[PDB]
Subunit: 394 residues, 5 copies
């Protein structure tokens, strides 16, 4: 009886085109805020943040006011899209093909004209995603909101603190906070300035998944590449082991190339770590080739340079703690035995060259172990957020 | 004649904005429920549940009432979207870019004003998908529904049991049940509380497909890694077999990484099982390198430590039940034979070192077999739902 | 002059809400049918059938009637969506995010009120896709259609034979037929029953593509695995060949896992055939390891069990049709020759062990050939539709 | 002043439902055509042609006529969708989920009532894509257009030549032409026939990309498979080379399987060429196994059949142009030398068997070279359009 | 009070169909421009440029004028889509399924009738993407804009400089500039010409990511292929190394084939560089086979041609700076020693053939190093933009 009469009196002469203020010269105050429910996806390749957000706009409408004594029990009214004036607040850095992803809902309005409008939405926004320190990265994704066509002389956009009380954690991102800032900017379109309200979502990557799928797999494969330095040369499988580990390393390099944006603003930390690992395994194949040359050295070839027999077989070999008819028979058997003696001297030279290969294996075992550890530790702990990651996520 | 007259009388002065109650101060009771027809997809990567649902809302409309004696044969009427008041019940945790995925249909209304509204829909909802016990997991996906803009003082949302009579089974998920609960919650938006009705779909993963594509393939590949301990060392193919099985293991690790969400709330069971398997095969490559060092040991190198000739060649080798001119000719032939004797002693030392490699193969064959069985059995039967899975799905 | 006057008289007092019958108590008869133009896609992973369909609804409208003598040349009229009453027939098992995929078009209406409505559409429907016999499978995909909100007391849905005259064949599916059936069902929503009309599309998979991409590639790779039994052991490439063929077999297992739905209602025929093939190649690697143990057997190790020298070197080797100073010189040369004699006896034992490996190769060549043929033939001809496939598609 | 007055007079009593003809009994002539701007994509897997098209419809409207002397400067008027009658011409073989992909724009109308309507659009259409001769294929994709609900007694659809003046070439398809044909067909829906206008886009695949990504890579890999016949047997890498080239061949077979539709209307040319190449490399692995059996033949085994020592070591080896105490010492040394002599005869037999392997390598080098060339040339030049391709694209 | 009165007076008799000019014979001037905010994506495979753009249209409306003295404080008004006349400016080369991707917003209008309309949008446009010089390419993507249905006699489209003040850099593309040009063209549709305004976005690819993911990985793999020329032949791993590096090269060839459009307008620079690298590694496998033939040459086979013993073992070997009863015993031992002597001469011939293989390794090491460097440098520095790339991006 009363709800029917109010809806009829409130729409008399109403115009959703008119900005709802008593004095046309003043700007209309609009308080903007939002509630962050869920971070659905951070698309590092497309540089897009997907979020589930309820936006919160509130203002006063001069013409949507009634006396609750004259409409008993009628304290709030509701209006759908197009039936009352709303602020046309849009996400400026939308990455949605439709641009505006807001699902339109009612505007709630109480008897003093106070209007509340909380349209839900799944929003996609453009966010520079800084992959310099990935997977130990912190991202600061901006969500810029402002009236599209109402400047500051017409619409006084004000900011209120973001709501995270109903926020649902994500398993890949720890929300650090959603600080906001109201700015007043000029655009070359217009002489009037246009206020906006930007919310910056500070979200920290959780690193357990990436530790177990990217960082830890790489360390063990790096350790496998050092088993080439422990394989005997006579096994015949050093290059197979080494080059196969190297082919195992490209699957990870393509996994990173597939998830990282194709940008030149910097080189990700993961890229520097995988590139260094692949250069340490790629250099262990180069060293393996040199080792095999020493092991398979032709004894009747060039003698061992004196610099080599001291640098390897003395210094490094100490540091590593390795260490008438009867005369014709005589002539003929002497040839057989002398042939054996020549084979022993050639064999001794071969064993001497083989021992050099063993020393080079041990040296480059130690050398590549130090390179792996320092590069692994140095690259990973160069990230500002590495210590925080191992404390919280491990 | 009568259907035409009723549709004309029923819309006189009607307003789809007005909540349809006789006394404005009372809230309107709305019974919400749903019918689960089909679970279309559980997206574990995007944390999204897709379902085919008919929602069921029912209420009374004070103004949609007629006397069937005055409209003979006219017992029900129908109204499309926007022509009569409806409750704006929305899925709160929608994951649809449009947010609201409901296909709007008629509202059926009989002569006493009882309104029935059953819009079908394909819904996408946000569901925390707990992959801790995957593939023997049970999921509890919530579907939260409530009026967006009508609080409890206006809309008394009530719950009714979910319908599963027309439910069509899925081959990957056994519906355990769809219990629902009506809750009354406060939000920082509003001083009035807002009732909602949540339905939790309890669905058990069926594990035959994952047994045959993830778990069983892994067991056999684990068994293949133990064939390296049975390959003779002289074959020249131990590292090839071992490292190739290890490269066969990464295809599965990338298959899991591709279907699992990138989260740090826990490590899936499948991840722990594949990671342990890859550490058992990766450790069989380390042990294989040690075996080859023993087999290819230089006889003129360091002698065998006394601890090694007892631990392996006595204890473990028993447990495993393995086990003037004529003088110049004399001098020259004595060298040939003594050279042969030195070769036999060197060969005996080599065979002794080769026998150690064989014992180490058998020990690590048994040791890695126990590790594989205990890790396989221990990790799999640590799942609460493993026994149920093998009973129902196998 | 007359078309303008008819469109004006026909809309006087018309209501698209009113069901178009003269007697409100009777149900309106609606004949439903469809024309199948093209099967666009059978999505076995998502269990979705895509089809290009024109639906065919026809009924009578009491108020859309004129005398063609009074409107010369005006024999048919046309009305767009929302301007005249239509039946709200929907696909019940729609898999489209919008649910209703029908493109709305005109309703044609002649002078006696007969209405024809043929909206085209690309439809996606939920279809249980039975992959038990894939790729020799026949599918029976249902398309359930009925009025959403009009029960049987209001809408007498009747069925007419499906049109396939304009059907365009697909290269993967031979349409067997589109039988339909009208059913009358009750739902827990409603006390009134709701008729529906279901069309079952019986479509046979054409198997040439899958013969050439799945079945034939697998047979040849199975034959390659038997070449390991023909490779000499001294080549050093048996495990490389065997395990490489095994790695070639996983690419196919992942191709099947990617196109098959992740369901536990059964194991596909292709899964049983590839799993058996991979178990025959995986068992040829196990047997290869045993062969290499025989070939590389240490002659100074355990002697050959008497059961082995009869089972292999007699039975199977027949079946397969294989088959003062002068005394010091004397002492020293006798050692050299006796050392040679011991080497010959050790070599004879080695050749004896090598011959056992050759016999085992031939036995397991024959044994695995029979297993491959019987498993290949047995699994493939266990399909009811295998004989039909080779007759029609090959 | 005049544009305002014309828009007001022209809509008086106008009805967009009425077909715009003076005599209702006559059909309305509509000239249909189109402008082909760009071929966006030919989807061979989904059998869908995407094109950027402007459609061109023109007709006369009896009621949209004015005297330009009475509306000075007003020579054309414009009307948006729904405000004037339009022909409901649709693409019949649309593959778009919405079915109708036309972007609606104004209808231009001059003073004699002539209406021009050029809606742009991105269209997806169903096109049988004949992959028999891929990548040297020519496709004839039909675009069928006709009024959905207006038959020939109401709408006289006429055809005009297609415009390609603003056509923008594509790098994969050379437009050969867009011939059109107007047809008059009957459908089982209706007793009246329905004219349509079909345009067939004849487009020739440009083959440079596919020459460099499919055909040329395959030829070189085929040539690599012949290097197995040049590898010495003592290298120990024949199977590794051969089987690795075979694994290199499957990456291409899966690339083709991924881009080709899963159809059984024929076997593509590329499929026959890759299948023959893989059977020539797969047969070079079989022959390699036979070669290794000859090379590793046990000298104490079965003698060489006389047919083998003539067919290979005579004929083919000519064609290929290959080619008291002193008596105890005597007894003992005679054994040593006779043992050497037996080793030489066994070695001579081994070298004889090794020479057979070399001849078989050279024969099968020549034989597989001829097979590769004839199969490569024969399969490729069996395409009708191969000569055109190498002339235009190379 | 005044905003309400202006919105009411301004819509009296207004028609959004009427072009807003005082004199109908004159064309309406419209200034078109745009603001480039962000380049979202350059799709080289689909030939589509995605951009975030605000379009800027401005014109005068004769009927939207008021005296601000009569409406105090009312200086601007706003109108939504369909309520006032707008120019129907469309992107001509749109690649969006909807064609028009513009998000409609208000038109701002001040008291002298000046209208400003800045609809945002995410636009997809067809752009010929010239991949000839990829990854050192510069692209010139056109965005053609014009009124769809208003020709030059009605709509005088004028151009204004593009705004890039709010442009946000992209990590893959450096915006070089957005020059625009206004053109007046004729179309076969129409006798009247139709102005358009085209903006060409000149964007330079940033090459760090592609240097590290495509170019640098390829160089090192090319260097690895040269390690085959340093591996000793006795290692038994030359083909394994060589062919494995060749299989490592196909992963890159498929990565390029996946991101490049399938076009025959040219061969990309990356394609020529990878194809040359794969032909240098593929030719190092051919040369490796020849080397192994020399190393494994049968000493009892054909002698070394005199041309070979000079070209390799003299010239190239200097350039490279490589370098009664007692008579029976006598007869028997003479055989043993003469057998040894024959083995030494055969061994000397073998070592001579082995030395040739070593020289060929060193020659082809140097030769392939020069080929790699010249092909690497020559192909890369043939790009006009290579020097700019290394200066700016490295
Ligand atoms: C093509 C066929 C290739 C393999 C078979 C021919 C090998 C010939 C051979 O040497 O056989 C040997 C064994 O052979 C047998 O006795 C059994 C042969 C049949 C095995 C079937 C395997 C099929 C593999 C298909 C692969 C397809 C892969 C896919 C292709 C794209 C012959 O033995 P032998 O040395 O003559 O014995 C000497 C006997 N003596 C002591 C009396 C002297
Ligand atoms: C505008 O109105 C004011 C007061 O009503 C008047 O003085 C002024 O002349 C008007 N301007 C025009 C251009 O008519
Ligand atoms: Ca992420
Ligand atoms: Ca699932
Ligand atoms: Ca299919
Ligand atoms: Ca194509
Ligand atoms: Ca790009």
């Amino acid at each position: 009886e009363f709800q029917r009469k109010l809806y009829k009196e409130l729409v008399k002469n109403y115009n959703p085109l008119e900005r709802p203020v008593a004095n046309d010269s003043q700007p209309l105050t609009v308080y903007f805020s939002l509630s962050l429910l869920q971070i659905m996806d951070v698309d590092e390749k497309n540089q897009v943040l997907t979020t589930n957000i309820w936006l919160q706009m509130s203002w006063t409408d001069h013409y949507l006011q009634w006396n609750v004594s004259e409409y008993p029990g009628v304290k709030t009214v509701r209006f759908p899209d197009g039936q009352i004036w709303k602020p046309d607040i849009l996400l400026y850095n939308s990455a949605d093909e439709r641009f505006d992803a807001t699902f339109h809902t009612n505007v709630l309005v109480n008897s003093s004209g106070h209007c509340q409008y909380l349209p839900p939405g799944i929003f996609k926004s453009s966010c520079y995603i800084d992959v310099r320190w990935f997977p130990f990265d912190v991202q600061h994704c901006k969500l810029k909101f402002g009236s599209w066509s109402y400047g500051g002389w017409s619409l006084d956009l004000q900011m209120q603190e973001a709501d995270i009380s109903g926020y649902i954690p994500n398993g890949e991102w720890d929300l650090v906070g959603i600080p906001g800032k109201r700015s007043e900017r000029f655009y070359e379109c217009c002489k009037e300035p246009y206020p906006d309200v930007t919310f910056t979502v500070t979200m920290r990557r959780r690193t357990l998944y990436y530790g177990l799928n990217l960082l830890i797999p790489c360390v063990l494969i790096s350790a496998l590449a050092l088993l080439v330095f422990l394989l005997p040369a006579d096994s015949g499988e050093k290059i197979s082991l080494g080059i196969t580990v190297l082919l195992s390393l490209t699957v990870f390099m393509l996994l990173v190339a597939e998830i990282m944006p194709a940008t030149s603003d910097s080189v990700p930390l993961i890229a520097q770590y995988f590139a260094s690992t692949m250069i340490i395994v790629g250099l262990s194949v180069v060293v393996t080739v040199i080792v095999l040359q020493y092991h398979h050295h032709d004894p009747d070839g060039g003698k061992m340079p004196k610099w080599t027999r001291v640098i390897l077989l003395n210094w490094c070999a100490w540091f590593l703690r390795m260490k008438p008819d009867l005369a014709k028979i005589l002539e003929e058997v002497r040839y057989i035995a002398n042939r054996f003696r020549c084979q022993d001297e050639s064999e001794a030279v071969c064993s001497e060259w083989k021992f050099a290969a063993c020393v080079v294996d041990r040296l480059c075992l130690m050398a590549f172990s130090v390179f792996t550890i320092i590069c692994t530790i140095g690259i990973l702990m160069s990230a500002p957020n590495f210590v925080e990651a191992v404390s919280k996520d491990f």
